[PDB]
Amino acid sequence: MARIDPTKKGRRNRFKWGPASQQILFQAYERQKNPSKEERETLVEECNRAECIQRGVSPSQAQGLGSNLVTEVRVYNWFANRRKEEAFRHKLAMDTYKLN
Incomplete structure (x- = not known):
């Protein structure tokens, strides 16, 4: 009984970002720090591109990453x-470790 059922989302295991993907995230940070539109929408694409390459998935199906x-x-x-x-540490201000 009880069962494990999805809460919402967070740090899913099967999901990784990825190495190139880290570069992608950083080079979003290069541009924009308040995620408005194109930026992010772009970011998903940029990333999907970089991710699909890691699998040799078709560009026109980069989302096939699945x-x-x-x-x-x-x-x-x-x-x-x-x-x-x-925000966490910004409120607590005594919690540099144990995840700011």
């Missing part, structure tokens, strides 16, 4: 990590 599909909510998540990585 298992590790960089959907919007993932990118939304990472920026919403970064600003929370502030």
Whole structure:
């Protein structure tokens, strides 16, 4: 009984970002720090491109990644990590370790 059922989302295991993908995330940070539109929408594409290459998946089906599909909510998540990585510690101010 009880069962494991999805909460919402967070750090899914099957999902990875990826090496090139880290570069992608950083080179979003290069441009824009308040994720407005094109930026992010771009970012998902940019990323999907970089991810599909790791699998030799067709560009016109880069989302075929499937298992590790960089959907919007993932990118939304990472920026919403970064600003929370502030917000937590920004409120506590005694919690440099144990995840700011």
